[PDB]
Symmetry: D2
Subunit: 198 residues, 4 copies
């Protein structure tokens, strides 16, 4: 039974980069909805499966991908942010960043590019390619989860749906991106990165 | 040279159904951006074409579909609304509505369904099937235009991107839908509908 | 636990419209393969679902739709064909055809057009729109099944994947489409049709 | 105005890895067809663009990408093959292979895997990531070209559409992939490779 994870901080802990109103609606409304819908969809799939109803299984994929993906994306996104966030990582993550992207600064510009590049709803990601053994940036549409659809392990995700910023930054997505860098929780991103090492 | 069409009314003419802030940002920012980008993209395509650069032509499709589609969608959307809007059409359109959807009320619920059904950004449409000679509802993702991607002629479009309602209705899209019915300009929809008759 | 259905006739029963080599390969190799792959995929989804592993469920979707859809489509396909087949349908189904598409030949041209129109691999279909309560033609990419992806009820399907005709017709898909009309099993198409109204 | 390029060798030059019947059909029928359809599509887009008809431009995109891509892919394909071909590449390209994929055999398994993995019609590719400055493998659906859709530079392409192997290998795509390694023209792949660094 999937459940809505508690935010690691208060709804206003990211001010002024991401105001409390956005944070509150994001946890309590958008993420809450998809968890419940994910559960409803899963139950349905369990029944369709048991009866060998392939057609039902297919018709249910969009809702499962969207609600399941949404739950995955927000669970990770919350952890990716912090009131102590900002700055740059150190050690291996930072070393990998320069290695695969030239410099941390170039990296920000690239991930910022993929994120602003999303036409419509979506997410920009810094993920790890286990097969290639290196970092990689990818953009995913709507709620399609990174690992489930590309195989890359999610490290840093920048939610770019308009409910992630419109109330505060309106149609100017670049300002949202520039701002979010101030709250990135690199300790978590580093943790995730190291979990790929082992 | 494509240009930003003037709204048929003032930015606050749709209050309280669609507030002036949304209207202003929608005309002046979202629609304005895509017209300019559409022009830039077209120029590029003219050059790619002239040189027989097929790869360039392909790489340019997303921007052309999105910006071109966006311009088409908003040009129509503005005309689809009015301060006198609301109610129901009469004559042939209304007759076709009952004919193809049972009743006007059933129709609203169906178009409302496709519109709320959009997972991510998109549009809900009431269009005309020239080949079948009847009305039809369709949902299109992001800025993909109705006629250009389905062949159906656009009659009524309900923009469902979050910039069409988030500031006022937040994450509750149904309230936005329920509200928009009050400003639908049926005279225009009827006009468009009749242009399919001839 | 899904199984490969025996054909309703001899492998060379559809000669000379579809030769025995094709029929045999198509049944014993192509359909058999998706049957097995489906059973494998479903088993995996069963474990994923039981573990609450949403990522895995998402990753399995392409295979489930492809193999699951492959199984649905080919099963229907075999029943839509007959060595005694051909000609035209009669009664209600035939009435619907005249009404929905004008005439049998107009319907034929439309189904043929949709089938020849498939770019890459796919299927052309004659379906039933329960909502609108009428006939509707559609094309599906790869093995995406009609109902699971469009909500339409499959009545008649035409496989336009190259393995469905290449050995006998090579690149000339049109020659294949013309020939297949001779072995259509309207008795079966009719059954599926009458089962829609109930 | 696009034209069909003569093959660099005799239709039966790749025997017995790819037989003469396939080569001839593939060149004179399949590639020829996309060449013509491309010229037709481009001419239409030329008129659409000149008239500012965005809807028409949008409608033409699927055909432009399919035919345009078809032309790009097959042109590259012919040069990637040689009757004297086979073996392994040497020097930088070979060095990159060992580095990017471990070894030649690891690279082979990966390209083969991507090619066999294509569900429906498509191509497996060995490309060059100019941004990351390294080799990268990818698969493209139908005729979607490598660069125009992924930004990667095509070095080696493997057509896994059924018309590329069915007459000779039937459903056994793996047998096709193994055989094709014998006629790869590394001299050409190398040229494309060295042209990337410049
Ligand atoms: Mn979100
Ligand atoms: Mn809009
Ligand atoms: Mn088949
Ligand atoms: Mn080919």
């Amino acid at each position: 039974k999937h459940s809505l994870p508690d935010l690691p901080y208060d709804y206003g802990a990211l001010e002024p980069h991401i105001n409390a109103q956005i944070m509150q609606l994001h946890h309590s409304k958008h993420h809450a909805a998809v968890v419940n819908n994910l559960n409803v969809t899963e139950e349905k799939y369990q029944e369709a499966l048991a009866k060998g109803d392939v057609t039902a299984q297919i018709a249910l994929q969009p809702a499962l991908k969207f609600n399941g993906g949404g739950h995955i994306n927000h669970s990770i996104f919350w952890t990716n942010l912090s009131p102590n966030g900002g700055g740059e990582p150190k050690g291996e993550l930072l070393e990998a960043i320069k290695r695969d992207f030239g410099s941390f600064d170039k990296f920000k510009e690239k991930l910022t590019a993929a994120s602003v590049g999303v036409q419509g709803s979506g997410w920009g990601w810094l993920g790890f390619n286990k097969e290639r053994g290196h970092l990689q940036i990818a953009a995913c549409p709507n709620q399609d989860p990174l690992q489930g659809t590309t195989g890359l392990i999610p490290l840093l995700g920048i939610d770019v749906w308009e409910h992630a910023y419109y109330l505060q930054y309106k149609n100017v997505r670049p300002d949202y991106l520039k701002a979010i860098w101030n709250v990135i929780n690199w300790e978590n991103v580093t943790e995730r990165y190291m979990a790929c090492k082992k």
